[PDB]
Amino acid sequence: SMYHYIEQTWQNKDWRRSILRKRLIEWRRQPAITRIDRPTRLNRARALGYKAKQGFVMVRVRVRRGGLNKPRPNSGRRPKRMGVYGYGPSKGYRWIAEERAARKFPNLEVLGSYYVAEDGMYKYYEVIMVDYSHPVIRSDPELKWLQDSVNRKRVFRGLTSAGQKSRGL
Amino acid sequence: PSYVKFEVPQELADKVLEAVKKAKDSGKIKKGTNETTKAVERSQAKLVVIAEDVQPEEIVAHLPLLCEEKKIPYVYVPSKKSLGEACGLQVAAASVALMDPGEAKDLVDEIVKRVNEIKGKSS
RNA sequence: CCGCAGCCUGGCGUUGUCCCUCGGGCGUUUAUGCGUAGAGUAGGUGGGAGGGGUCGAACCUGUCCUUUCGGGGGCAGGGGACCCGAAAGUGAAACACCACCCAUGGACGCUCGAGGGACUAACCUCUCGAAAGAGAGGAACAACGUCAGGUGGGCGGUUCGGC
RNA sequence: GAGGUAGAGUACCAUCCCCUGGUUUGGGGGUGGGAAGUUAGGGGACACGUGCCUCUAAGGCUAAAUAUGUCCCGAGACCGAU
RNA sequence: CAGCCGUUGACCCCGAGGUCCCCUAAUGGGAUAUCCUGCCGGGUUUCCGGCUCCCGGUUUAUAACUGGGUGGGAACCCCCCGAACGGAAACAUCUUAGUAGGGGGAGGAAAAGAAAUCAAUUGAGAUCCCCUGAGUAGGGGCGACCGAAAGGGGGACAGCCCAAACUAAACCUGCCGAUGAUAAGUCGGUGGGGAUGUGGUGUUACGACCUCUAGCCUGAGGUUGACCUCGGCUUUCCUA
């Protein structure tokens, strides 16, 4: 399939990593949460459940890498509980990126994510989101589970793929 | 872009689009990049037509190298919407493969000669 | 008694293009050597008293480099051909030839580093622009993330024996 | 009988921090490196080798068995105007 | 005190309707004013409708217009951030305790859930809860203290669906008309999607699935014992 060859050009250590560097220069200027027209990696999107119907949207999110933005305590602590450096959010940056996308698009449900790039200050992810109220999605037989109100806003309760991994499941 | 290997003069491009229209009516063609690569893998294609405004570039960036090793000629076309129109579609197409030219056997043979000499001067 | 921030410094990442120099190594390339007793430069382990000799030698005369100017190492001609000992001294001898070592310097192809210089397109700063984008200056440093060492009553927890 | 397919910054490694009974062996996160891909991968209490045994990560969904009590019915070796 | 309603069946109870002031998520704009004040459309005294972040469309392009999350709930539930008092007869690792608390998100239950699992001479077979295993293995200034799982007995006890190989528009959906019980569906006309892949097949391990070749196996029909086409089964949609 052509999807097998998409993953080969974007694989590991390649001349393609000269093309991808040029994109990053543009991506650093666009807003931190943007809707994009088409997935950058169709192999990753189609495996996670993206289709070419209307109601599927693609969002790119950039976050800031590093550890937790943790302040030094100001009241009295034992020496164990006074340390700052080395802490990272037990939630992954992949799960943090999905959460910020679900804030800006409150009518869509997160289906998956994968990252696309990385530089010295940010990490970039792309999130697959679907509109559960469009009549095209409402009639789909493979997403009939998405008509249950318990299956909405799952990203906030750790029920996505990135959340299951981080819960030790 | 970057997957465009050699320049194609505009007068040759219109010949390619004419070949696609003739081949569709009489012979067989493959529309789309999923059907085109599978024809190149099986060594069944006779001419592979590639658009020049594909975004992202990764969709068709493997075709020039894949058919280089299978000994299959390939040519470029500026607009994918025009390429989709030629093969009788309501949407665009990024790649087409001619299974058998049919009524356009002579026209295809003319194109291959023109392309082969352009690559000879491109080193 | 201890911790933790902040600060200083180094590694890794973001981080790229051209050089030059130096120091290591790998397979090669080569030519250079005086504790004393003595024909005299024994630096050491061996084959080796034969090795060179129209299969061209010892010898006078100079150009030249060098050294504890001690003295040896290389130059063609004049010479058409000679010297070391198996013999005399040395806790360890043969400039009798050939090998390796200690040890000087340079060069080939490869690797690793370390330093210095330049450049602009990342990054940063400013200006214009509603935005899109354009211009100027710096620049692979700064800045940021992460790890490591130092400093650190700035701040936090505590201990401050007994009779 | 012959051929084709099987989920990537993912598995894993070093280091730092928090959890854990997890201890030279478990889980999650930050930083750096980073696969194989069916002639493949994972596991079987330090590490590796050889047999043997067992499974298929990195894409979702899924009744019943249970947790609660604002509320409605019933009950009681409950209290009885400090 | 005074008057009235009810045998033309009231009051009262149950079911279905009507009216339903202002603030309030508060939502046209403003409120340290529970009060003020607009711009479009409709009839027309009153009055009644429309007026952040997204999605799918219209129309000339940043103008305008059609159709579609926010707050509450006594406790219970899911996810991140996260102490000290106290005990150790002092106290700092430790414990207290991932507790108290903070932030975000639901439901009548949530969450988990169909092995890259366990254990041991080749066995069991998704998840959850109860009685146990057991204060055992094991962690610890090896101090105070902390602490499983497999297995056994029970309660309930289901299993699918995608990406990929093979096909390649055979596809989905808004509005209008007919038919259909105003449903699903079928037919016709218009718009938006879709080759950067819609629909079909198909998802498991000493092997599964797919393609080709060869050979054997319900009914009717055609063709050259062999081939193909319509009648059972599986999955899904629907409501008078």
**Token pair in block for residue B36:** 């085109």
**Token pair in block for residue A28:** 């650093």
Exposure pattern of A27-47 as b/e (b: 16+ CB <10 Å)? beeeeebeeeeebbbbbbbbe
Q: Phi-psi region for residue A43, left (φ > 0), alpha (ψ -120 to 50) or beta?
A: alpha
Resolution (A): 2.7
A62 phi and psi angles, rounded to 5 deg: -120, 135
Cα A127 to its chain centre, rounded Å, is 4
Whether residue A42 and residue B55 make contact (CB cut-off 8 A), yes or no, is: no
**Token pair in block for residue A90:** 């037990």
Interior angle at CA A157, CA A151 and CA A158, nearest 5: 100
Protein side of the strand C interface (CB < 7 A): A 21, 25, 28-29, 65-67, 72, 74-79, 82-86, 119-121
Half-sphere exposure of A92 (CA within 13 A, CB side): 19
List strand E contacts in A 101-160 (CB < 7 A): 104-108, 131, 133-136, 139-142, 144, 149-150, 152-153, 156-159
**Token pair in block for residue B8:** 């194609």
Distance CA B95, CA B57 (A): 13
CB-contacted nucleotides of strand C (7 Å): 2-6, 13-15, 122-123, 132-133, 143-147, 155-158
Closest chain A residue to B1, measured at CA: A19
